[PDB]
Design a protein around this ligand. Sequence first.
Ligand SMILES: Nc1c(CC(=O)O)cccc1C(=O)c1ccc(Br)cc1
Ligand SMILES: [Ca+2]
Ligand SMILES: [Ca+2]
Ligand SMILES: [Ca+2]
Ligand SMILES: [Cl-]
Ligand SMILES: [Cl-]
Lengths: 362, 365
Amino acid sequence: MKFTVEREHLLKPLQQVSGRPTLPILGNLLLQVADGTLSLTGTDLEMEMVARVALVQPHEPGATTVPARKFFDICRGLPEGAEIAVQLEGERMLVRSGRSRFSLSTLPAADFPNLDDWQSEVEFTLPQATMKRLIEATQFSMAHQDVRYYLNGMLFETEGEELRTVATDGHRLAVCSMPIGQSLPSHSVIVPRKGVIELMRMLDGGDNPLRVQIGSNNIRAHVGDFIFTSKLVDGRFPDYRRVLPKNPDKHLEAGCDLLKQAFARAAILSNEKFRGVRLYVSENQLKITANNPEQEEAEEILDVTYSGAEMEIGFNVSYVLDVLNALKCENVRMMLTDSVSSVQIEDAASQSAAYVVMPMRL
Amino acid sequence: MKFTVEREHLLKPLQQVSGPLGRPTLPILGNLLLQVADGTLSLTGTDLEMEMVARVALVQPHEPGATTVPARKFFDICRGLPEGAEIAVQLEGERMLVRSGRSRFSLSTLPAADFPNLDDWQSEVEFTLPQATMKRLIEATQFSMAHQDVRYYLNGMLFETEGEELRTVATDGHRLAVCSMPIGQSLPSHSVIVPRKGVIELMRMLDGGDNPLRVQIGSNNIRAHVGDFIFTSKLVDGRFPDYRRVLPKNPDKHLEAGCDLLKQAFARAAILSNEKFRGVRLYVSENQLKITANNPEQEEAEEILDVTYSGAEMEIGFNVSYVLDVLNALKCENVRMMLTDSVSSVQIEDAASQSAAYVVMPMRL
Ligand SMILES: Nc1c(CC(=O)O)cccc1C(=O)c1ccc(Br)cc1
Ligand SMILES: [Ca+2]
Ligand SMILES: [Ca+2]
Ligand SMILES: [Ca+2]
Ligand SMILES: [Cl-]
Ligand SMILES: [Cl-]
């Protein structure tokens, strides 16, 4: 195996495939020269990323694996414009550029783990911007290290012509749906949280669409010359349709920024261990109050649009701030039922994302 | 006590005086002292080793008096209010009420009388210097300070007045940094240890403007005045190592090289150095440097560079992190390494200036 290529052509591929490993070979990249192509592959056993680089300078086929981070840091640390010559020499891989030389340890390409082969059952394309919107809208509501493993990822659901994401940790839920102009079978799978992250990282923001393939136990995404594949998570994800409040009859509209800053300020004098605030809803007015063990008190009064019965209801500050930060809105609609029931929250101008938040007792 | 102030008149002062303060040992140490007197709001934060005081002119109606309130909470409130907001503040016994628009905050107080103050002390030396000079002096050496060493004095930074120069020295027992800058006045000879957190505060108060820095030093305190801020620290009582005895005696061998090429070569070689011991080898020959690294995985890096060097060949090992720290602190065009042999320290300087010197001990590889 032998190739020479510009540093410039390696940097993006290396960054993508490089994303303490539980087994040494999982800290290595698989390098393969075949035809006029260098392929680079990274994997953590649950997912993998493959990148391709065209070779025009003399090259020789073959394959090996080398330490990912070291190889990346070497390439990145060489000067702009550098040409990098690489050749496998028994147990080492020699990397040369200018009067810099590096000898890296190898592990056999034969050892490099592959995902058990699988079959695509559902396929579609969509714009990168759309996938980005869908993930960003809901990612923050995924569980972290919940024993209910299926909550640690994100539901991807096809229905009609829409792709939908759902995420929840049992206390708050996020759902976002976007049309993609293709008639789709109804289908639902759970992508693990590291997969969601990896998938976001491969989006750059061109009009070049993403190609998605979904199997019974895998998801694959192709964009540019990168191919990402992840295992899916087993289990029965919650049905957002049953989480949405049935009759959230009390509708309140507020400015998003004003609401956010009122929450943030009042939270300063909330309990540090469990930060929440009390909302008193009255005709065209919202009062937000916080109290702490030191008997300190914050109060914020806001003008809002609300006509309906008065009620007091408490919320975790972070849950509401997370939602407002995901909506990036001009005005927000809060749809309330009573003091002990979850609230539904949306951009006042769009129904494509919705958030459900359990109340907090204070 | 009453005052009303525009958010931005109050905000940077609040930020600044909260500097010496996470989890305060006792509640008062988490508070700022507020004093309204003679048209001025004074704010003070302390950690018992040092104090930062800010004076804020009051152009709106006010009433004198003093209290203490939680620093972080008060700052976060003020920062969190809208740009240009008017902040009205009044002491009401056990609480201090802050009002702005339809935002209200009640903060718990502790008596001004309980706020600790540094003892009176007398200044024995005084001078003014440009902020940029103090910045230069500190940045040149701060990285060589020890970290939680039992020789407590190595955790601070030596400041020395001598001739027309102010000097800083820092060392952790393995490498040393020393930097001297002219300021234009003759000074009596003083040598004081500024505590770690003091160095950080001196740096924080440099606003990057043309307000000069005024320094006063006593036997057990240092004070710095910039604009409307006054910083005071106790000095560390200890026996700091003398740098003059650390500088290699007769470094006969002088190498010059481009700083950035040298840095980037070391940086790449470091990748394949021992993760704990970080050893690299330098081979010095006529107008050439070769840098090699290897690790327990039997991986190897080699870098060859053109340098200016005449005279006897030699080989010497160094901790590459210590070397990179020096090159990063020098930030210049060309560097001079002054060498003796494989068992002796190296002295490193900007080739174009003797104002900063660095001493790094060798490693047996
Ligand atoms: N059905 C759920 C499961 C699956 C299961 O327990 O078998 C797990 C966690 C939550 C739910 C909810 O119904 C739920 C309710 C309100 C909000 Br806000 C978010 C989720
Ligand atoms: Ca991977
Ligand atoms: Ca929806
Ligand atoms: Ca000097
Ligand atoms: Cl030393
Ligand atoms: Cl070599």
